[PDB]
Design a protein around this ligand. Structure first.
Ligand SMILES: [Mg+2]
Lengths: 100, 10, 276
C-alpha cells in the first residue's frame, strides 16, 4: 500500500539557555501507518524518561505525535531524535539545533 | 459529548 | 472567536499480535479533553482537562460505553473491508473516523463533519449539506447504500446541529479561562549569513494558542509566498505552538524584507523586521 514517511522536528519548549531546565521535543508528523519508533538521544545514547502525546491525526489522515523529556541543556551536550518507521530502511537521526 | 448510533457498520 | 469540537478515532489491526488497537481522542480547538485507549491499564473515556472533570461518573460511564461500542464496530468493519477490497487477512490495516462541529462567535453552527478513511485514504464522507455522501470508490458505495438505507445522514445531521453545538457551547463556558483565551505569539527575527552574498532571515512565532497562525515574508511590500520556507506549526508541550518562516535574501537587502504575523490573539496583524 501507499505509505507516508514521518516529518521530524527537534526543538525545545522554550528558547535554550545553558544550565536552565527546559523540555526537549521531537515532533513526528505526516506519517502513515501509525506505528513508529521514536527515541530521544543525549550524546548518542537513548534517554529513558521519555513521554509521548496521545495518537491523533491531521485533516489529511496522517498521524502526529510529540515525544518529550525534561532536560537542562549545556554547551557540551548534544541531543538528537532517532525515528524508525516502515517507510525507513534504517533509523533516521535528526540533531537538535537550538536555532531551528 | 460523543454521538451514539446503532447500525453504523460499513 | 470561532471554535471547533472534534472526535478522532483510529483502529489498527495487527494479525498474529492480538485484536486491533483502538485509540480515540476528543478536542475543543487545539485542547485535548478526553482520550480512550483499548490497550490502557483500565480503558475508559478519561478526562484530560480540568473543566471537563465536573461532568460526573455517569457521564464517563456513558462515554466509555460509546468508545467500547466503536472499538467493536471497527473490528467488524476491518473484516468487512478486507472482503470489499479482496485483501489477504494477513496484513495490518487502519480505519480512521473524525466527526464534529464548528461554531462561530455566536455559538451557531458554521459546519458539521463526519468522515472515514481506510489505510489513510478517503473512504466515505458526509458532505457539507449533512444530507449526502462522497464515497471514494466502489467499496465505499456499498457502505453508502447501507447508510442511505439506515438513514444515517439524517441521524448525524440532528447530532451535529444539536448535541454537538450544545455541548461545545457548554465546554466553552465551563473552560472559558483557557478555551476562550487566545495567547498571542511572541515574535522575533533572526539573521544567519549563508555566504559572502546571501543570508537567511527567519521570522519566529512562539507561545501562541490556538495553533492557527499566518507568517508571511514581504520583499518591498510584495508577498514572497513561493520563496518562503515554512515549517509546520509544532506543539511546545505547554498548550502553546511554535512556527517559523524563512527567506534567503541578498546580503545588504535585509531591511527590504518584512515579516507579517496574523493570529487571533493579535488585535491587528503585526509587522516585524531584522533589528540589528
Ligand atoms: Mg524501518
Amino acid at each position: 500500500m501507499i505509505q507516508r514517511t514521518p516529518k521530524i522536528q527537534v526543538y525545545s519548549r522554550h528558547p535554550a539557555e545553558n544550565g536552565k531546565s527546559n523540555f526537549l521535543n521531537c515532533y513526528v508528523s505526516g506519517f502513515h501507518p501509525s506505528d513508529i519508533e521514536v527515541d530521544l538521544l543525549k550524546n548518542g545514547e537513548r534517554i529513558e524518561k521519555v513521554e509521548h502525546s496521545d495518537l491523533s491525526f491531521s485533516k489529511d489522515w496522517s498521524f502526529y505525535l510529540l515525544y518529550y523529556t525534561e532536560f537542562t541543556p549545556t554547551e557540551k551536550d548534544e541531543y538528537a531524535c532517532r525515528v524508525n518507521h516502515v517507510t525507513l530502511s534504517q533509523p533516521k537521526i535528526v540533531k537538535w539545533d537550538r536555532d531551528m | 459529548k460523543r454521538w451514539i448510533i446503532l447500525g453504523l457498520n460499513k | 472567536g470561532s471554535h471547533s469540537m472534534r472526535y478522532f478515532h483510529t483502529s489498527v489491526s495487527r494479525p498474529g499480535r492480538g485484536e486491533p488497537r483502538f485509540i480515540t481522542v476528543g478536542y475543543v480547538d487545539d485542547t485535548l479533553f478526553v482520550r480512550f485507549d483499548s490497550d490502557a491499564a483500565s480503558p475508559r473515556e478519561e478526562p484530560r482537562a480540568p473543566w471537563i472533570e465536573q461532568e460526573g461518573p455517569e457521564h464517563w460511564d456513558r462515554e466509555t460505553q460509546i468508545c467500547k461500542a466503536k472499538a467493536q464496530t471497527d473490528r467488524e468493519d476491518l473484516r468487512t473491508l478486507l472482503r470489499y477490497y479482496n485483501q489477504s487477512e494477513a496484513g495490518s490495516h487502519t480505519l480512521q473516523n473524525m466527526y464534529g462541529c464548528d461554531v462561530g462567535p455566536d455559538g451557531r453552527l458554521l459546519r458539521g463533519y463526519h468522515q472515514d478513511a481506510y489505510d489513510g485514504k478517503d473512504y466515505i464522507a458526509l458532505n457539507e449539506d449533512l444530507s449526502s455522501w462522497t464515497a471514494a470508490d466502489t467499496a465505499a458505495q456499498i457502505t453508502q447504500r447501507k447508510w442511505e438505507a439506515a438513514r444515517v445522514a439524517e441521524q448525524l445531521r440532528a447530532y451535529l446541529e444539536g448535541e454537538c453545538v450544545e455541548w461545545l457551547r457548554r465546554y466553552l463556558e465551563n473552560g472559558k479561562e483557557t478555551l476562550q483565551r487566545a495567547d498571542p505569539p511572541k515574535t522575533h527575527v533572526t539573521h544567519h549569513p549563508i555566504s559572502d552574498h546571501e543570508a537567511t532571515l527567519r521570522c519566529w512565532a512562539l507561545g501562541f494558542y490556538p495553533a492557527e497562525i499566518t507568517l508571511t515574508w514581504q520583499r518591498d511590500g510584495e508577498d514572497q509566498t513561493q520563496d518562503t520556507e515554512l515549517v509546520e506549526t509544532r506543539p511546545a508541550g505547554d498548550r502553546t505552538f511554535q512556527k517559523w518562516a524563512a527567506v534567503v535574501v541578498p546580503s545588504g537587502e535585509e531591511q527590504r524584507y518584512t515579516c507579517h504575523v496574523q493570529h487571533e490573539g493579535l488585535p491587528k496583524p503585526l509587522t516585524l523586521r531584522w533589528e540589528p
